Enzyme design. Structure first.
Site, PDB file in Angstrom:
ATOM      1  N   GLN B 139       0.762  -1.164   0.055  1.00 44.16           N
ATOM      2  CA  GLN B 139       0.019  -0.033   0.066  1.00 44.16           C
ATOM      3  C   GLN B 139       0.966   1.269  -0.040  1.00 44.16           C
ATOM      4  OE1 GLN B 139      -2.835  -0.180   3.170  1.00 44.16           O
ATOM      5  NE2 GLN B 139      -3.821  -1.924   2.291  1.00 44.16           N
ATOM      6  N   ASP B 186      -7.037   5.232  22.164  1.00 42.34           N
ATOM      7  CA  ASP B 186      -6.263   4.710  23.661  1.00 42.34           C
ATOM      8  C   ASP B 186      -6.346   6.293  24.304  1.00 42.34           C
ATOM      9  OD1 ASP B 186      -5.709   2.440  22.730  1.00 42.34           O
ATOM     10  OD2 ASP B 186      -3.676   3.181  21.892  1.00 42.34           O
ATOM     11  N   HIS B 214       1.318   1.237  20.133  1.00 36.40           N
ATOM     12  CA  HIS B 214       0.135   1.108  20.246  1.00 36.40           C
ATOM     13  C   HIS B 214      -0.206  -0.323  20.887  1.00 36.40           C
ATOM     14  CE1 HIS B 214      -4.320   1.050  19.858  1.00 36.40           C
ATOM     15  NE2 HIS B 214      -4.353  -0.113  18.992  1.00 36.40           N
TER      16      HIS B 214
HETATM   17  N1  NAP Z   1      -5.406   1.396  16.576  1.00 36.03           N
HETATM   18  C1  NAP Z   1      -6.727   0.737  17.353  1.00 36.03           C
HETATM   19  O1  NAP Z   1      -6.868   1.362  18.313  1.00 36.03           O
HETATM   20  C2  NAP Z   1      -7.123  -0.315  16.405  1.00 36.03           C
HETATM   21  C3  NAP Z   1      -8.583  -0.659  17.004  1.00 36.03           C
HETATM   22  C4  NAP Z   1      -9.453  -1.670  16.514  1.00 36.03           C
HETATM   23  C5  NAP Z   1      -8.724  -2.444  15.586  1.00 36.03           C
HETATM   24  N2  NAP Z   1      -7.200  -2.044  15.407  1.00 36.03           N
HETATM   25  C6  NAP Z   1      -6.552  -3.170  14.306  1.00 36.03           C
HETATM   26  O2  NAP Z   1      -6.822  -3.024  12.685  1.00 36.03           O
HETATM   27  C7  NAP Z   1      -6.801  -4.219  12.144  1.00 36.03           C
HETATM   28  C8  NAP Z   1      -8.236  -4.749  11.800  1.00 36.03           C
HETATM   29  O3  NAP Z   1      -9.082  -3.528  11.966  1.00 36.03           O
HETATM   30  P1  NAP Z   1     -10.813  -4.253  12.620  1.00 36.03           P
HETATM   31  O4  NAP Z   1     -10.726  -4.712  14.028  1.00 36.03           O
HETATM   32  O5  NAP Z   1     -11.718  -3.061  12.306  1.00 36.03           O
HETATM   33  O6  NAP Z   1     -11.207  -5.339  11.481  1.00 36.03           O
HETATM   34  P2  NAP Z   1     -12.401  -5.482  10.453  1.00 36.03           P
HETATM   35  O7  NAP Z   1     -13.323  -4.269  10.565  1.00 36.03           O
HETATM   36  O8  NAP Z   1     -12.984  -6.819  10.693  1.00 36.03           O
HETATM   37  O9  NAP Z   1     -11.514  -5.510   9.077  1.00 36.03           O
HETATM   38  C9  NAP Z   1     -10.462  -6.394   8.819  1.00 36.03           C
HETATM   39  C10 NAP Z   1      -9.962  -6.210   7.538  1.00 36.03           C
HETATM   40  O10 NAP Z   1      -8.802  -6.940   6.641  1.00 36.03           O
HETATM   41  C11 NAP Z   1      -8.876  -6.624   5.359  1.00 36.03           C
HETATM   42  N3  NAP Z   1      -7.804  -6.767   4.311  1.00 36.03           N
HETATM   43  C12 NAP Z   1      -7.056  -7.840   4.204  1.00 36.03           C
HETATM   44  N4  NAP Z   1      -6.003  -7.549   3.426  1.00 36.03           N
HETATM   45  C13 NAP Z   1      -6.523  -6.177   3.164  1.00 36.03           C
HETATM   46  C14 NAP Z   1      -5.828  -5.575   1.961  1.00 36.03           C
HETATM   47  N5  NAP Z   1      -5.140  -6.040   1.115  1.00 36.03           N
HETATM   48  N6  NAP Z   1      -6.256  -4.384   1.827  1.00 36.03           N
HETATM   49  C15 NAP Z   1      -7.464  -3.844   2.427  1.00 36.03           C
HETATM   50  N7  NAP Z   1      -8.218  -4.663   3.193  1.00 36.03           N
HETATM   51  C16 NAP Z   1      -7.529  -5.817   3.669  1.00 36.03           C
HETATM   52  C17 NAP Z   1     -10.275  -7.055   5.078  1.00 36.03           C
HETATM   53  O11 NAP Z   1     -10.781  -6.419   3.948  1.00 36.03           O
HETATM   54  P3  NAP Z   1     -12.318  -6.146   3.622  1.00 36.03           P
HETATM   55  O12 NAP Z   1     -12.357  -4.692   3.862  1.00 36.03           O
HETATM   56  O13 NAP Z   1     -12.264  -6.096   2.129  1.00 36.03           O
HETATM   57  O14 NAP Z   1     -13.113  -7.195   4.067  1.00 36.03           O
HETATM   58  C18 NAP Z   1     -11.140  -6.697   6.395  1.00 36.03           C
HETATM   59  O15 NAP Z   1     -12.074  -5.728   6.416  1.00 36.03           O
HETATM   60  C19 NAP Z   1      -6.504  -5.241  13.267  1.00 36.03           C
HETATM   61  O16 NAP Z   1      -5.071  -5.591  13.140  1.00 36.03           O
HETATM   62  C20 NAP Z   1      -6.626  -4.579  14.534  1.00 36.03           C
HETATM   63  O17 NAP Z   1      -5.842  -5.158  15.671  1.00 36.03           O
HETATM   64  C21 NAP Z   1      -6.509  -1.192  15.666  1.00 36.03           C
END
Ligand code: NAP
Ligand code: NAP
Lengths: 374, 374
Positions: B139, B186, B214
């Site tokens: 990306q 956070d 994080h």
């Molecule tokens: N910083 C923070 O406070 C925070 C908070 C929550 C989560 N996170 C982190 O963010 C990540 C997931 O977020 P989430 O909990 O919101 O999960 P989520 O809504 O279920 O989304 C996960 C995504 O992975 C995607 N994916 C896989 N390869 C990809 C790529 N090539 N390009 C674009 N999309 C891709 C999927 O694509 P599709 O869109 O096509 O399904 C799916 O939507 C995790 O590692 C999580 O720990 C961080």
């Protein structure tokens, strides 16, 4: 049947200040009490934050959320309330979660009743009406007993129309004009479809109205609709489409939407709900109108009384509304509207035991619940 | 590695008008191009509509959404885009969905990179970094090759900090100051906790900053925080709490949140994300600041260079920012910040094969991913 039983606040929302109007934020209006049933469901999980952000009532309208849930989903409600507190929304002055309508609906100025039991695998319409009707029969007594005499009630839990008739039928102290059945998601979906066909962006289509039940008998009215300012009829000249196809497109939107794997139109419905509330809290644009399943008494269209039938309304933005009189009808429209009316009156009879009319008599078509709905 | 391959629009969003600034809606600014990875996920399903409603960039800012997804979840992306069209959001001038970064990131002014692969059942941190690092490495090249030379990139997919270092490392043409790691959820969770302890509503707490990764090594800084205007230290005099307990409360918020049955902090994170974007698009309030995992080069704190380390920043609301200089440190703070730094530098080495440094050397603690995160 509580009285003296007041709803307890939720962590941080208990530590809230005086009341916006005198120290800080004197720009803010007096707090609005909003109750939400089905508070732990998906549509709510979207709706709630839109409310808290001031998207719905405005940026100078401190809000109070009273989230009504159910025993089984209490952990979920605590969770949503926990997300509510980590959102740091300034307008969200206070929130309270619970499972008792007489407590939660206490002093509600808006009762957004999303939430009812889903259609069972082999469940006959009649019972779908019975089950959810009971929920709404109860919430109606509560609202009546412990809510603001002018609660604007907005029903989204299916069968919304009947569920609403029942609610007002058990809430006599509350003006029946106040009960609204949400047919707006349907309106929005239809604008999108009329824009798609005419080759214009959805912001150019207007005057779209929905008549009848929130079911496959409703009528996406294309005769009074307009595109760019001129009746749809003379923009989408493919008259056969408008009659033979248009309806089925809006009527299946949710169905195709669900094919793009299992999620309900939560985000969209959440949106329809706020657009709905705004059409009552904001003065309707000159010459336009919105759709809402409301009480029929007083309607000038000829539609039968004593039911909740979606129809064109306009408002000055005070919570109330008035039916739109400058509208036309033809064989097609007239017959289609009358066919939804038939359904509604049948549900009414089928729900006589929850409306205070008498012994129920069910004779309903088990094929009318809109595709894509839980 | 596309070039000449432009992103195709989505139904209705293809029928859009000229460009706000000259016929109708001359009150509107020039359209903003926003790209969203993980566009079909839960956080996105919330974020997207907040963007479209103008909650994020304002009511006079027409938006363009370029939703990047993945092969497997394409049906889902079509679905979200379908909900987007049935929402009738005027600001949402155009949307396009796809699976190619070089196409989707084409001309992006904001790249909200939520979305990465979830932690496997028996997955070691190192590989968690490897897998998602690759996604972000790619990306980054795309962004670099086909995006606005001043794309403000906001990373939320974990391990966000490293994922961001990698992204900028593979996007040399793009200023490294532009890459942000989302530590805001956070921050918000911590304000809520400091409000809860002090007995004040979260709107009275301010100057809360988050340092480090994080992960469980981050530091909810209570020393520079303030409540009502006076340092938290002299409001919550229970010093042992602030040191021995405070941190673990914010650090487990998500963990307890998930106990209220299985849903992630989607709505809240969706909110943190918009607050994050606003802190860059809106002039920081006099004397306050926000937290963001940014590039370390130039920092006056003494934190090591060549990494993404969350720290206090303020902005004039132009997309850029500057580190906050008026801040104090003590044994506790100093040692805690340095301990997160240790982690980060280790991830850095563990991710040497995606950053262009060399052969990877992993020596990481498999216990640091925050409770409640997918
Ligand atoms: N910083 C923070 O406070 C925070 C908070 C929550 C989560 N996170 C982190 O963010 C990540 C997931 O977020 P989430 O909990 O919101 O999960 P989520 O809504 O279920 O989304 C996960 C995504 O992975 C995607 N994916 C896989 N390869 C990809 C790529 N090539 N390009 C674009 N999309 C891709 C999927 O694509 P599709 O869109 O096509 O399904 C799916 O939507 C995790 O590692 C999580 O720990 C961080
Ligand atoms: N009018 C429209 O266009 C439209 C659109 C979508 C759905 N609907 C209809 O609305 C109903 C469900 O909406 P949904 O799809 O959003 O489902 P949902 O988000 O999954 O919520 C369903 C809810 O039933 C609730 N519940 C059961 N008894 C209750 C009671 N005693 N009081 C309060 N809540 C109660 C649950 O309570 P908790 O909150 O405690 O979990 C649950 O949240 C269905 O009948 C559906 O067909 C209508």
């Amino acid at each position: 049947l509580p009285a003296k039983q007041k709803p307890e606040c939720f962590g941080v929302f208990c530590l809230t200040y005086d009341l916006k109007a005198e120290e800080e934020t004197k720009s803010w209006k007096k707090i609005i009490n909003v109750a939400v049933s089905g508070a732990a469901g998906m549509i709510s999980n979207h709706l709630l934050f839109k409310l808290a952000s001031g998207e719905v009532f405005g940026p100078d309208q401190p809000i109070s959320l009273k989230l009504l849930g159910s025993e089984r989903s209490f952990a979920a409600l605590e969770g949503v309330a926990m997300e509510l507190e980590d959102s740091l929304y300034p307008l969200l002055r206070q929130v309270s979660i619970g499972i008792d309508p007489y407590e939660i609906f206490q002093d509600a100025e808006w009762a957004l009743l999303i939430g009812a039991k889903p259609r069972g695998p082999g469940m006959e319409r009649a019972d779908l009406l019975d089950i959810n009707g009971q929920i709404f029969a109860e919430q109606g007594k509560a609202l009546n007993a412990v809510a603001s005499p002018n609660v604007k009630v907005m029903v989204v839990g299916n069968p919304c129309n009947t569920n609403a008739l029942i609610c007002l039928k058990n809430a006599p102290n509350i003006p029946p004009k106040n009960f609204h059945a949400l047919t707006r998601l349907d309106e929005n979906r239809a604008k999108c479809q009329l824009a798609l066909k005419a080759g214009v962006f959805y912001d150019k289509v207007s005057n779209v109205t929905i008549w009848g039940n929130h079911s496959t008998t409703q009528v996406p009215d294309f005769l009074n609709a307009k595109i760019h300012g001129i009746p749809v009829t003379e923009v989408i000249r493919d008259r056969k489409w408008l009659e033979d196809e248009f309806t089925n497109m809006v009527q299946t939107r949710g169905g195709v939407l669900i094919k793009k794997w299992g999620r309900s139109s939560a985000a969209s419905t959440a949106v329809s709900i706020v657009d709905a509330i705004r059409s009552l809290v904001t003065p309707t644009p000159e010459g336009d109108w919105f759709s809402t399943g409301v009480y029929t008494n007083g309607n000038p269209y000829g539609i039968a009384e004593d039911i909740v039938f979606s129809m064109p309304c306009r408002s000055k933005g005070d919570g109330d509304y008035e039916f739109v009189k400058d509208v036309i009808f033809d064989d097609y429209l007239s017959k289609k509207i009358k066919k939804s009316e038939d359904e509604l009156l049948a549900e009414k009879k089928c729900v006589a035991h929850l409306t205070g009319e008498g012994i129920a008599v069910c004779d309903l078509p088990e094929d009318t619940m809109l595709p894509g709905e839980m």
